[PDB]
From a paper:
In the case of iron, the protein was co-crystallized with FeCl3 and the structure of iron bound IbpS was solved at a resolution of 1.8 Å. The protein crystalized in a different crystal form with the P1 space group and four molecules per asymmetric unit. All four molecules were bound to a single-iron atom at the same binding site. The structures of IbpS and Fe-IbpS were nearly identical and no important structural modification was observed. As suspected from our previous analysis, the metal did not bind at the canonical SBP cluster D protein substrate-binding pocket. Instead, the iron atom was located near the dimer interface, at the entry of tunnel identified previously. The metal sits in a cavity formed by residues S86, K87, Q110, T111, M334, and a triple aspartate motif of the α5-β8 loop (D191, D192, D193) and containing a dense network of water molecules. Nevertheless, the conservation of the residues involved in iron-binding in IbpS strongly suggests that the binding site identified here accomplishes a common, essential function in all members of this family.
Numbering used by the authors:
A (entry chain A), B (entry chain C): 28 to 372
The structure:
């Protein structure tokens, strides 16, 4: 189907969605269910009568889960949203995605949406420096990769496993490109603590157990009283991308899915719920920042290009494994199995 | 450089190799060091004064290891020998392999050798049924995949993790192609015990802890008094391939490396040391068997084709992981790190 952007108001879509039973099911990529709590609360407050049944798991498990459900005709979710961005052109070509251009589609940065409406970039995520501002004064915030190699940061770093998350991995890819394998060798001499779940480094830095990490997302607008700060490099690369979302052709609740995607693109959602950059050209960067496509030291398309060559990703991942070891510990979302219909209890 | 098969006798190559210091270092794919003990013993007994410094690790770790050593100019081994067969044309194209047609090159089945001498099929491995013949009479040996679903085998199977070894994985790929995902579903209801290391199921079947496994190698001619038997299906597919070996262009001991490759193809090695099929057309299979390329229910090239598409391999691996869980336990070869120069202590 050839479609035009939805011309309905959010409330008009909501009236249609209400007739579908009161729930929309989203398989969302992430580390822990709480990372989507803010979206769920905001959505459900905005739309009484419709539950956002968002279920969080690592994107590399959700995409497999979806492929298997499609193979076995047991598809559960209405919507998929993941950082494994290469899946979306593949699912599109497979014919399993509903072409839908949500409200505001015309204002999305072209790179951040499919031309036919098969998928949409929902919001921007970036991985870079997160520092404890009480442990480190501003003049000593590590911002470039090699700052993390200075003597006083030995034993004070906590890092997400790069062999457990390809967005984390891509940070290392860009840095090895620039500084060589020697960076990775010297980094290990800092006795970093590696953990699964990209939420965990920020959590432990917040409680003052570690001082900094260079592969974390975070609020561009810190809360008053915050003891952490997301800080971009002055010159070194950082990782960024638009999290991709799509509606399945055979979704049981298509209008509820449309409501969800249109709500995600709404300027208020983009500025007050999403905590980093917007995918829209008519939404102002938070004061002090530029649009994500205006930074010379990141390139969201580069992450997409990276993710499209699985052999190249695999070969780089396995080499990183030899430096950091196998990814220890349980997966942070818990084990959802083949057919989760609700979040883990 | 265009080369012809080595026209020297083994003894001639051996005289040259003796001048190089008495060691040849081989990075060999495998689950545990003891799997190469037979080769090591036979080689060193045939060529006093030359040590086969064969170092065993999972192929998926050795190839990354080699890539990183190449990238950092820290290459250690003279010879690489792995099941990750797709690595060999890539290393060929990178220019890091020494073109060398060993003695007997002309008699290697064409599919099992590089046209230029960049690599050679060293010996044939197959994964299929291994049964305990004391626990199970012949009429009840499971041979077909669906035999393993019978009631009395519940709690009585031990299986290599398919998400820890791609040759193990390919067995499942072929069986899902034929029987669908339902086989994998029903298999989990049999409560199989999964383990890392393809040696481990056999080891535990041999002591009578389990009755059978369907992804193991084994002797085509069982030893006198054996309590296990390697048995092919009557009709279902099984996995087979020629393990590939190559000499590095910058091998420190090239004549010793050539001795090793020529020794691999020597009739005595192909008939008395290698325990499954030979890569040579002029080596008769044991009675009861045909050449590995004459079975309609296996195809060595299908495994090579499989392994060449890393994205397809990844997507199938991740789905299998949803059924069997993450691969638990330590890696069976131990942790060798970036630069092993000798086997682990
Ligand atoms: Fe990922
Ligand atoms: Fe493998």
């Amino acid at each position: 189907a050839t479609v035009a952007p939805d011309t309905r108001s959010l409330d008009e879509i909501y009236q249609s969605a209400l007739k579908e039973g009161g729930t929309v099911t989203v398989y969302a990529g992430g580390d822990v269910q709480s990372q989507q709590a803010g979206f769920k609360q905001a959505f459900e407050n905005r739309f009484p009568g419709i539950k956002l049944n968002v279920i969080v798991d690592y994107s590399k498990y959700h995409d497999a889960r979806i492929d298997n459900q499609l193979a076995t005709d047991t598809l559960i979710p209405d919507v998929v949203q993941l950082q494994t961005v290469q899946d979306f052109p593949r699912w599109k070509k497979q014919g399993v995605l509903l072409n839908y251009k949500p409200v505001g589609w015309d204002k999305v940065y072209p790179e951040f949406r499919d031309a036919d409406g098969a998928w949409i970039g929902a919001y921007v995520i970036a991985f870079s420096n997160l520092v404890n501002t009480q442990l480190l004064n501003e003049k000593s915030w590590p911002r470039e990769a090699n700052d993390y190699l200075r003597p006083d940061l030995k034993g004070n770093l906590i890092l997400a496993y790069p062999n457990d998350d390809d967005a984390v991995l891509f940070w290392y890819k860009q840095i090895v490109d620039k500084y060589g394998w020697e960076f990775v060798e010297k980094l290990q001499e800092q006795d970093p603590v590696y953990v699964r779940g990209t939420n965990v480094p920020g959590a432990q830095i917040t409680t003052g157990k570690y001082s900094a990490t260079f592969t974390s997302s975070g609020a561009l607008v810190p809360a008053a009283g915050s003891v952490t700060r997301f800080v971009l490099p002055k010159t070194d690369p950082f990782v960024s991308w638009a999290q991709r979302a799509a509606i399945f052709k055979q979704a049981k609740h298509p209008e509820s899915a449309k409501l969800y995607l249109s709500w995600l693109l709404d300027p208020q959602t983009q500025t007050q719920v999403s905590r980093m950059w917007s995918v829209r050209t008519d939404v102002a960067p938070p004061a002090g920042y530029k649009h994500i496509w205006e930074y010379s030291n990141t390139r969201p398309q580069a992450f997409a290009d990276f993710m499209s060559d699985r052999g190249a990703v695999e070969r780089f991942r396995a080499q990183m494994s030899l430096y950091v070891g196998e990814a220890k510990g349980d997966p942070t979302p818990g084990w959802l199995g083949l057919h989760p219909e609700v979040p883990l209890a």
